[PDB]
Design a protein around this ligand. Structure first.
Ligand SMILES: Cc1cc2nc3c(=O)[nH]c(=O)nc-3n(C[C@H](O)[C@H](O)[C@H](O)COP(=O)(O)OP(=O)(O)OC[C@H]3O[C@@H](n4cnc5c(N)ncnc54)[C@H](O)[C@@H]3O)c2cc1C
Ligand SMILES: CCCCCCCCCCCCCCCCCC(=O)O
Ligand SMILES: CCCCCCCCCCCCCCCCC
Length: 564
């Protein structure tokens, strides 16, 4: 009905991070008709604009509310896996940390045309940085906005840095400068524009919505790609949930469907379209169009656990919880004024934007990311404690002042999977993060050693000044076995999720797409989202997604080639 009688040069399945970049670059010259189908609503929420309102976005109507299958290795728990559901996707709901990982992360992909030297100019093209001028590693002029965080906790941020120096870690002045080693302590840059979230809807899509050749539908759930026998024809979707009429948007001759539904929903939708392991499709009576074993395999996510400690009574009130709430759970006037007057102060913080990358045991690249928060977790699950913090508003209670260190396995060895639980394309996917399943126990050892590192930092003179005991994991958790059980019971997502539609070289039979991002065995079908990442880089995954989307757009518009 909104597509009746229309023919599209490009149909984007999803209106998230990658889709926003592609909708912008593909519609640019006026010659191509682009459709974007997003299941979620328009991006208008003030909870998206204000970085600290990340707390409110978890388990909200702007999230998919996904839970994993029971995880026998994690004390028989389902794991919550946050995912954005609105224009901008997970860029509209993420912690805004700007990370590329190390050059060695892209070289480890072993994909022709996607080496560290190949990708660097695509990160640089995307970037405008408030704190780094143009150079080998930074651009000026791209649509992204990156800056140093405009909240600083004067006591606790500097005490973390001095504590890290004291235990023997060195400062890293730029975690995205590939000329120096990734390890070290310091400040994470953020995808913000003077303290407001600079998500890919705001930076790429919203400024071009006036273009005649670009049509964006929200509340549009894709149910499958229509494939002829194997040639993509377009896509089926409902604008009215499960009971809605299945509409079909149709490709023009020479047109392409681009999958932009992310590392959870892209392999889910491929499987519903007959692209996936034939046994999984047959289970639910889906005809096999392309028997690709790797669809939904190779799920990489970075698992987390945390430590937390209160400050001494004399330091009551110095935490970011004290900067955002008064002692009855009212948003502080000073925080609202600082945010509106100059884009500064606690409401500009997602909390976890200072930290470190650490080698626990002489690895080629750091295995551990630490995120320091100048506020105290009240749950060993940091995502649950952010939900608690949002729900705390107006309860008339005082959040106790302290700190948290979140420990992340940033280059994990474990893998999981996404598949089907049902023939219904509106049902949730069958999701397994597979945390701590790697044969050598390397991911558990990383997090155990992370806990030891966080305790070494909290014990240093610099932080000892402020701290008064330890809340998590606490005095009952000391031996290796006690720590390992604490990790099993508290492990949560740091919200990466990549690699479920892996790009590969010629002759890599685990791959779903080639180095041109084309799905094996289907014409006119590509994947441009985190699904394609062969091996997860260290650090958060949003900037690498934007880099892939920029380079894919340059490929599709004929401004660049891949391989030569
Ligand atoms: C809570 C959280 C915290 C994070 N923290 C950070 C961080 O600090 N920094 C960082 O760089 N990265 C972070 N990440 C990761 C980063 O945001 C993602 O890796 C990145 O945004 C993924 O982009 P994408 O295009 O692959 O997918 P998404 O941005 O998730 O886009 C997928 C889109 O597809 C839509 N969709 C799904 N199914 C359908 C369907 N059937 N029909 C139509 N549309 C559909 C979704 O609603 C969504 O809008 C975070 C992620 C989250 C969720
Ligand atoms: C932990 C809770 C997070 C708090 C987030 C909400 C704070 C509300 C402050 C009062 C409203 C702020 C003014 C409106 C600004 C809207 C955002 C923007 O347009 O940049
Ligand atoms: C966005 C401002 C939040 C302040 C919250 C105070 C409590 C601190 C808890 C940190 C929790 C663990 C690490 C971060 C989890 C990130 C989702």
């Amino acid at each position: 009905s909104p597509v009746a009688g229309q023919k599209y040069d490009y149909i984007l399945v999803g209106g998230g991070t990658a889709a926003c970049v592609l909708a912008n670059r593909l519609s640019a010259d006026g010659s191509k008709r682009v459709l974007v189908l997003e299941a979620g609503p328009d991006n208008t929420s003030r909870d998206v604009k204000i970085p600290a309102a990340i707390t409110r976005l978890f388990r909200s109507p702007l999230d998919w509310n996904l839970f994993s299958e029971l995880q026998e290795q994690l004390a028989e728990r389902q794991i919550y896996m946050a995912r954005g559901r609105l224009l901008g996707g997970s860029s509209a709901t993420n912690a805004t940390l700007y990370h590329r990982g190390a050059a060695g992360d892209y070289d480890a992909w072993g994909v022709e045309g996607w080496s560290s030297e190949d990708v660097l100019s695509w990160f640089v093209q995307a970037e405008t940085n408030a704190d780094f001028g143009p150079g080998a590693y930074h651009g000026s002029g791209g649509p992204m906005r990156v800056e140093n965080p405009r909240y600083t906790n004067k006591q606790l941020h500097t005490a973390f840095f001095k504590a890290a120096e004291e235990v023997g870690l060195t400062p890293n002045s730029d975690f995205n400068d590939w000329s120096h080693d990734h390890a070290g302590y310091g400040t994470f840059q953020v995808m913000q524009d003077k303290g407001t979230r600079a998500d890919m809807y705001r930076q790429y899509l919203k400024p071009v919505l006036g273009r005649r050749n670009l049509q964006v539908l929200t509340g549009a759930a894709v149910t499958k790609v229509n494939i002829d026998q194997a040639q993509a024809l377009g896509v089926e979707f409902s604008t009215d949930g499960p009971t809605g009429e299945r509409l079909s948007a149709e490709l023009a001759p020479g047109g392409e469907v681009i999958m932009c539904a992310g590392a959870v929903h892209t392999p889910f939708l491929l499987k519903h379209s007959g692209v996936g392991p034939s046994a999984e499709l047959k289970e639910f009576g889906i005809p096999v169009v392309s028997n690709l074993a790797g669809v939904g395999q190779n799920l990489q996510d970075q698992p987390a656990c945390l430590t937390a400690a209160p400050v001494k009574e004399k330091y009551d009130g110095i935490a970011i919880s004290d900067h955002i709430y008064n002692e009855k759970g009212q948003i502080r006037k000073r925080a609202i004024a600082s945010y509106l007057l100059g884009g500064r102060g606690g409401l500009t913080s997602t909390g976890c934007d200072r930290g470190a990358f650490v080698r626990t045991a002489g690895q080629a690249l750091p295995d551990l990311q630490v995120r320091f928060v100048p506020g105290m977790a009240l749950d060993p699950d940091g995502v649950s404690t952010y939900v608690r913090f949002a729900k705390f508003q107006s309860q008339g209670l005082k959040w106790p002042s302290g700190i948290t260190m979140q420990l992340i396995a940033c280059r994990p060895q474990s893998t999981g999977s996404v598949g089907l639980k049902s023939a219904d394309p509106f049902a949730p996917p069958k999701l397994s993060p597979g945390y701590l399943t790697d044969k050598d126990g390397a991911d558990l050892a990383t997090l155990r050693k992370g806990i030891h590192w966080a305790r070494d930092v909290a014990r240093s003179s610099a932080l000892s000044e402020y701290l008064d005991g330890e809340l998590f994991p606490g005095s009952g958790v000391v031996s290796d076995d006690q720590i390992d059980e604490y990790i099993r019971r508290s492990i949560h997502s740091s919200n990466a999720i990549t690699g479920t539609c892996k790009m590969g070289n010629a002759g890599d039979s685990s791959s779903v797409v080639d180095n041109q991002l084309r799905v094996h065995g289907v014409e006119g079908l590509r994947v441009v989202d985190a699904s394609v990442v062969p091996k997860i880089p260290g650090g958060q995954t949003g900037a690498p997604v934007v880099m892939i989307a920029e380079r894919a757009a340059a490929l599709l518009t004929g401004k660049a080639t891949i391989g030569a």
